[PDB]
Amino acid sequence: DIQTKLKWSWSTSVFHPESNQVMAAPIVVQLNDDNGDGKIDEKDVADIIVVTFEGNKYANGGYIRALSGVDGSELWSYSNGGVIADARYAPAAADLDGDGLIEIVSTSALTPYINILDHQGNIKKQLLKSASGWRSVGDIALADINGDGNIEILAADGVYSYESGLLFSHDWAPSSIAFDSNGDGQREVFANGTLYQNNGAYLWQYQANDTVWFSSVANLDGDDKPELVVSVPASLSTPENSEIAVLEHDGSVKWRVNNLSNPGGSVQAVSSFLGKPSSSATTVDAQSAVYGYTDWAHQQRVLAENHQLAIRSGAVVDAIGANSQNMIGGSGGSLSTIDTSKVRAIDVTYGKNKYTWKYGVLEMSFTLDNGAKVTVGSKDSAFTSTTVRYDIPQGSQLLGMNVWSKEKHLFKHKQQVNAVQFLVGKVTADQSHMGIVYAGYYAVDMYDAQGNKVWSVANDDLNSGKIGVSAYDFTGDGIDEVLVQDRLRMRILDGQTGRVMGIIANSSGTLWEYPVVADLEGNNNASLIMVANDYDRESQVNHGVFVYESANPSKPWRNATRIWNQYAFNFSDINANGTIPTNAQPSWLTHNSFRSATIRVPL
Ligand SMILES: [Ca+2]
Ligand SMILES: [Ca+2]
Ligand code: NA
Ligand code: NA
Ligand code: NA
Ligand code: NA
Ligand code: NA
Structure with missing residues (x-):
């Protein structure tokens, strides 16, 4: 009580x-x-x-x-x-x-x-x-x-x-x-x-x-x-x-x-x-195997933002990131996006690049929930290759990837994705x-x-x-x-x-x-x-x-608003000092409350 x-x-x-x-x-x-x-x-x-x-x-x-x-x-x-x-x-x-x-x-x-x-x-x-x-x-x-x-x-x-x-x-x-x-x-x-x-x-x-x-x-x-x-x-x-x-x-x-x-x-x-x-949040709780070549490359985690990943690719898979500005890999390739919430399987082709004789990820083919296929890179870039499929577990979604890209002794425009690993989590x-x-x-x-x-x-x-x-x-x-x-x-x-x-x-x-x-x-x-x-x-x-x-001094009522300035109170239209923001971020994407006194940090 x-x-x-x-x-x-x-x-x-x-x-x-x-x-x-x-x-x-x-x-x-x-x-x-x-x-x-x-x-x-x-x-x-x-x-x-x-x-x-x-x-x-x-x-x-x-x-x-x-x-x-x-x-x-x-x-x-x-x-x-x-x-x-x-x-x-x-x-x-x-x-x-x-x-x-x-x-x-x-x-x-x-x-x-x-x-x-x-x-x-x-x-x-x-x-x-x-x-x-x-x-x-x-x-x-x-x-x-x-x-x-x-x-x-x-x-x-x-x-x-x-x-x-x-x-x-x-x-x-x-x-x-x-x-x-x-x-x-x-x-x-x-x-x-x-x-x-x-x-x-x-x-x-x-x-x-x-x-x-x-x-x-x-x-x-x-x-x-x-x-x-x-x-x-x-x-x-x-x-x-x-x-x-x-x-x-x-x-x-x-x-x-x-x-x-x-x-x-x-x-x-x-x-x-x-x-x-x-x-209610969807979080990473499992991963695929590592596909490709990790030597001389540091694993870097890439989480999807707005259930989207950015990929630059041409003949091969060059870089992967949450968006076009924060991408792991080389500088080349054209830009595409993947809606990760629709991915149900990925086929990864990795092996020896026939143009450069380096080993890396040559192609990824995403199968979406409607059966459509989204591909980046090309299997035709292989001198030798292996193809493997990872199925997104039933009840889970693709949430991100670990990405390996080697830099040593490579021009930036020839660096590419050398290994990948898929991160998944249960949907809620x-x-x-x-x-x-x-x-x-x-x-x-x-x-x-x-x-x-x-x-x-x-x-x-x-x-x-x-x-x-x-x-x-x-x-x-x-x-x-x-x-x-x-x-x-x-x-x-x-x-x-x-x-x-x-x-x-x-x-x-x-x-x-x-x-x-x-x-x-x-x-x-x-x-x-x-x-x-x-x-x-x-x-x-x-x-x-x-x-x-x-009544209990060891049970303070914490994290309450300093201000309740109108009947239709929902934080976003008032600052603590009483000023009103000119372009407040949407209430439903931050604390997502209405007539609550509880201070909440989004996400
Ligand atoms: Ca006073
Ligand atoms: Ca004063
Ligand atoms: Na005033
Ligand atoms: Na105005
Ligand atoms: Na409007
Ligand atoms: Na909505
Ligand atoms: Na409570």
Whole structure:
């Protein structure tokens, strides 16, 4: 079990003491100079931003409050009278203008502007919204979607430039995200089932039975392309309209589920829940014999990159490498490539070269899984030769080669491959460790990448059907646990089985908030942050913000993000200091997670 103890809590204020309920996910960013060095950066203690409301008035706006990561004390003076934001959606934060200080982006149905606050809670910029009222209120995500160095704001009624304001309008969407769907370097915008180019041009639209709420991007199959996970919560009286679905980059359905035994669901977390990322990796575990002549040559290992090997060859096999720039062998021959994932056998011809009278590899003939043959070199180069076949074992793939090439007393343009050896390994599904988890009206359900349900854990959310989840590796074994919330309890669930590993009393009427793990101090021992409200008789335990830490000093919560800057958090769109990258590498090819706090190194 995971043992916890309270780090601090916030439940009251001298500024509007009646506004003390919270029902939107917390945000974590640096807002003050804790160490007194005149700067605000990752050396300080990250802070919490929430929106508070009074009683049951969560639909009528609330106050943005900044809470110190150290002790929960309020960092702001509210000398401006406070800033109203919608209390149902978390704001978003980042250093938008590059001055080293965090800005906070939010809006409400009561203002015609997107309000951008400085780190002290005072208005800094305003952008006139496309829509008014409830149609202009939803999630906000921050990204540089066209790579021009300026940050775009993805809001409920359109996409905005921090500098120039509204770029294009769209119908109300509770959720928007950006990702490069087609590999052209530009990020498209996905909102309420519609994929737009970043100028607003329509690309495609997933036809659903009700509003499409939050989405995740991840790699859930065997290619380098992104997949999209989407939730349609519908309502408890129209459960036939709810679903969870995985879409391909072109909008086609990979799989979808309508589950009448657990309808609803507005948001998911996607992460390494079913195993460690390494448990899905294909590694070398066997090899062929050595074919050819090893005298006066040093064995050098060549592993295939992107399941490809490069080969230069003419009359004979001259050089082999992972790519054309890092090749073992002589300088001659023309260039070809081999798709190693398709190779099922290789015939190697080695012997005395009739042109030079040297001994080496004269030809290799690859048999592919479709029966086609790819050859390099030529058997006709032999004065004498031997031909041998190596079969790739069933269930294994060709992963690389050991290559011998003699240099002594040879011109570089006459050096060649003198011996070869094939390296193979057992094949495994590239995403067998990945899971998709979400909460419905009745339970938290975990799915594998193919749409098979792995487990279901009863979780009372009859009042909403949209409650959120997040992910974090509390135990430190490389596999994320699931963080869940219902009317009365926050719980930690085992990723592989759903077993309950921790329970914390924490009440909420529930909307779509989730708990957050973040390493506030940066010393590799994280904090667990959750919001609470007690206005409803069926969820009357506590109210405010409650922050926990590991109760066992020999069990620190390691490798947690220093920052959780928006509701659609997935690392790749934020740096630790709060700046936003101009061209971030694709999340689905690095940590391949969404709404996980766990810092992961790719591959
Ligand atoms: Ca400082
Ligand atoms: Ca701080
Ligand atoms: Na800034
Ligand atoms: Na931009
Ligand atoms: Na694109
Ligand atoms: Na993919
Ligand atoms: Na774990």
